[PDB]
Design a protein around this ligand. Sequence first.
Ligand SMILES: CC[C@H](CO)Nc1nc(NCc2ccc(OCCO)cc2)c2ncn(C(C)C)c2n1
Lengths: 248, 826, 325
Amino acid sequence: TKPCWYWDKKDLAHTPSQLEGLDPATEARYRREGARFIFDVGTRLGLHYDTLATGIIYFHRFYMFHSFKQFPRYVTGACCLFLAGKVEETPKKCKDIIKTARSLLNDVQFGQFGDDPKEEVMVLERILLQTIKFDLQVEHPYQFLLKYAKQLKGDKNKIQKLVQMAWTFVNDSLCTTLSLQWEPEIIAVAVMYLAGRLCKFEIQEWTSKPMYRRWWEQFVQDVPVDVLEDICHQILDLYSQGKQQMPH
Amino acid sequence: MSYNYVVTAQKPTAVNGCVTGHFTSAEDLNLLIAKNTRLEIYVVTAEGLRPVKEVGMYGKIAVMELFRPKGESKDLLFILTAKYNACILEYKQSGESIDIITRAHGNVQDRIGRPSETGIIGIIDPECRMIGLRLYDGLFKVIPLDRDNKELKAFNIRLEELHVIDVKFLYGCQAPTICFVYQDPQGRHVKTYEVSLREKEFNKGPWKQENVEAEASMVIAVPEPFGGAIIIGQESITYHNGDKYLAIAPPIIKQSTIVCHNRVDPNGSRYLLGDMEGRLFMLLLEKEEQMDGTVTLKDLRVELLGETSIAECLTYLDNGVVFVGSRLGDSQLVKLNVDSNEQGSYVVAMETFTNLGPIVDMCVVDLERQGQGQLVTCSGAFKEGSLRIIRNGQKLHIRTVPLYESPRKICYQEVSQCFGVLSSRIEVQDTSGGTTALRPSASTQALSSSVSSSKLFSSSTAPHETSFGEEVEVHNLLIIDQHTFEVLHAHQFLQNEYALSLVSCKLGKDPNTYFIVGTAMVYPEEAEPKQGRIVVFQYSDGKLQTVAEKEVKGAVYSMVEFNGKLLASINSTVRLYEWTTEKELRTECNHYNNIMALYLKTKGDFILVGDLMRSVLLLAYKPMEGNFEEIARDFNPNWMSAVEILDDDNFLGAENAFNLFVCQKDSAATTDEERQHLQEVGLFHLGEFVNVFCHGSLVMQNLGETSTPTQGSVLFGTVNGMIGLVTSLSESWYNLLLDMQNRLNKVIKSVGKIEHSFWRSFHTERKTEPATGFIDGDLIESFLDISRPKMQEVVANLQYDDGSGMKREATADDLIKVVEELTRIH
Amino acid sequence: TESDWGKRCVDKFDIIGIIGEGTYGQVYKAKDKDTGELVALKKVRLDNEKEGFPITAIREIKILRQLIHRSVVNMKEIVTDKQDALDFKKDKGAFYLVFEYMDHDLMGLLESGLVHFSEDHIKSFMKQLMEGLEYCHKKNFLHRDIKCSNILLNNSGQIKLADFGLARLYNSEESRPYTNKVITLWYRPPELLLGEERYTPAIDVWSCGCILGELFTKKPIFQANLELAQLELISRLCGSPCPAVWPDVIRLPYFNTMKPKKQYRRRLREEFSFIPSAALDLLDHMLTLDPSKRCTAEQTLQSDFLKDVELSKMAPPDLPHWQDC
Ligand SMILES: CC[C@H](CO)Nc1nc(NCc2ccc(OCCO)cc2)c2ncn(C(C)C)c2n1
């Protein structure tokens, strides 16, 4: 019926990119760049946050089936965003995405688009659709972060701080392979869990069951803490590696 | 775009209705006969009828009634067309000049309504206060007959009884009263209402509802001496009037369904009744006068008088003369005698009026080698079935070959100097367990005969119970000589086998010429036939010999020879068979994208397929590959009745709504999709139901005929006997004739003031479109009949195009020559 | 696996013929070589390369893989033309969307005049359509192109909604700018004629009500060629748009611009007096001018007309027979 779009961390050692001699750090960097490119291009175009995420998810899934050495990331990214716009009903013309991509990319980077940027992108749409197995509907942590937050009752300022901090963590998780490891529902919980620890908030008190120390089990069933910690660790690692610090 | 021309070669002959009254003068008794779109007016004489006037209306005549409102010297005529155009007409004569006056007119169509099952019904009050119309289920429309209602404005009264069978205005009521039979889940009932023009609604009726026969068909309004109504059914006749109820159930009427009634005696003592087998009965109202001075109905009696043609309408004239208006056979004038003849009959035929009847099929064949061509038509049904040989000679010469059974298909085989004709006769289950024919007919009077011995369906194991009295069809192939038209041979097909298709041709390398018949096994239980036979016959030395049989899984609706191969349509499938050296049919290629492949036509390696509901598909045989290819389809949905190929690009179709359309290949190779789309370029409401298209022309060809502007010749036969002709035009000739039509329509006065453009507009219950690509030749040919002042008025400011002179002014004499040349194509 | 769409080739289907022309491509009837199941194949051509894969097809793929209902057409898979080897750029072959073949479409049955609908037949039909619409409306998807041609019917009496090319999600909390002119004029609601642009799911209801009346009359209720003429026809039957019946009508862009000849009174019950009372009440509510007062899909299912209809008894309609030829 529907395809499986989630892998185990150990499996990422065997992507086409890895097996063509690309080392783990480089593929990670290539993904951070492609994601941040999709995010920046669409943000310049004024695109909804779901549209950016959908393009990023297409992008991440794509390179589970292909190698970065044979498919330029910035072309793939532009193609993903182009399709995402049509899927999420926030369409953009391919020429405008190229225009924005050129504004944001240097001369070396834009060389990936070759002599005819639009053609390279439009041609790729065929492979993208076949690669993502025409499974176009994608759910994102954002909707669950809001759906679950709406069930919290308490100080508006204390919660709203939780939501925004978690929202920032969601935007940051788009540069990682978490989208390929855990369903969006778990991600939304993980970012709520992380923000709570950082803000020293005890979320259970706001839940309908205030003695249920496992506050997430009422939103997402069958999630061990280890999963949430694994997700938190990866998100925090991104901040430790970068010069940026936790939003707080 | 495509340009075509359509003319009538023979006007409709079937009688759709007939009434008697004082229409032309308050003194003379007139018989008005209605044929589809044609009104014939006669004056009754002691010998017969004197014709006085014939008008054509731009509409199909559905209602025709004569009424005389207080203050009028003579009867007025009400007519309602099937397109809901209503009008009141008056006959006016000034010396030698006869004209028909339109006193009132309008369109009574409702925006929202469901057309009734039993069709449009129109009745007029005995006091001529209002016209009752039953157009839609659950609604009764009233046109009040006031002097000021020149537009025939009307209102609807809500009617609780949704399924009405028949309704009539009653005599002898204090207020306008309607008596009608209706059907609901509990059976059929008779009920009455009063119509109040002041309140514009129904009031309680004079007498209560009564439960009536399940198949109560007709309501007869009895006149003032008796009052009340008579209800005719299948087995019983009943009289109703308040507390009075009489019912007679003679066994004779049960045998055949009674379809038409008329009043002989103005007081209501005697009524005439006719049934589908042609028997004519006299219904007698036996009077009993009480000492009170009042008159009551004592009893009802039915007496058989004799046999007439199957009659759509009967009307008593005077003396013993009755006009038998027949839609399935020839109409008649018959005299009723007081004394029976030596055979026991009181009916003796006086005159016979030719009715080409339903033209199920026809072929054009040159019997005398003159090059003129003759049209042999399968005409009539049941006892009226006949073969009609028609030739041009200024009137058409028609010869009739009586068959006394229903003819279905005809095809000519020159090698054998004979015709092959498919026919069916009605037999009835009898006490022997078999069936007995009601009368001898062509299939039983053949010189030599044969009965099918095929064992293909012999295994059966499917029970089909038979009840005594039930009807069955028995199908035959008739071999008929082309000179004597004598039935030489008749082959009876299997029990429950219907013959649907017939061809005469040679196949493959076989030098023998065969009759080939496609059949279907028809059982009442099945929705669609699932068994069938393709049979190859050889007529040799006075005997028909079966050469081969091919079993199919469906009905062989249509067959046509295809370059030495046999092209047959079996239900959805369209199949091509090869004829092997072993004299057996061998399948080659099939096409399945059809719902019901009813009709087939071929030109070269191209095939035109007609579907029950998907219009037409252009197929092609690809010899390099040995299979079919879909060239182009008409995606617009149409119910087909007949199709024909005009040329390699234009295709002609006939709809069940009495419309004609012409499809063409879009001739644009830009996209393959454009080529695959057949664009309807011609739309035209013919007003007739076309069953057969046939290439050919009856006009004699001496090789000297001035080459007419029209090119091509397709004849078609219709259900009402009308024969028409379709031909193509050049763009220049079309524009000239089309511009002329628009000029003629402003000049010519229409009966009922019906707009010509509306009449010819494509019309389905769902859609109405303006006509396109068709020239109404009957309108063009009327230019020669309008007065000289009108002729010159028409030609004013008329310019020519694309000719020897780009722009040229036309004169009335110039057009007289052009139209006269157009009248020479038929 | 069954989920890896876009790879299997169209070779696996034997093409029977072209059953219609679709909006993004032509639609073919085909038979699966492996199973023998009849399918309807819809062709999507990206060769134009103006905007790539058509969004209309993207909508249908996105939505129909989410919607699973007896009265909603199922997309079985997506197959492709033999693609070029090693040359992905050169390949211009188009993909085909696979569906189940339905024996007829309502426009074809009604147009031929061959189909006859009894009350019970109309009950089974409308109940299936409204159940499908309720499922879709509960999922917050709007069809936006309800027409007799988009109702496919199997000879078994099963109804399925079919063309989801214009379908989009509806957000009650966030009003969004939408395509004003979505439904075909004959089935378009009065609100869109006046150009709401922020339409409710009730636009689909109005269309289905128009179908309800067309099944009784066998003729489309409101047939016009111009948007103003349609408002006139609707106004004569349903009443002229006025603030009393449509308080917010004054906010609609074209209310002052597009006026009917008169302020007509409502005549629906009078002109449809032949319709059964249980159904006439459904028509009155479905054909309500004010979208906020127009009944919902669930409400129609909970009507005297359709509530007690049992879907087990499909009661197949009187479909063309051999005798009708
Ligand atoms: C006809 C318009 C609709 C638009 O939707 N066309 C369609 N008609 C399907 N069947 C009905 C049919 C059957 C035979 C036929 O014959 C033509 C010549 O023989 C024509 C139509 C049908 N079945 C599935 N689909 C879609 C959802 C993939 C369909 N779309």
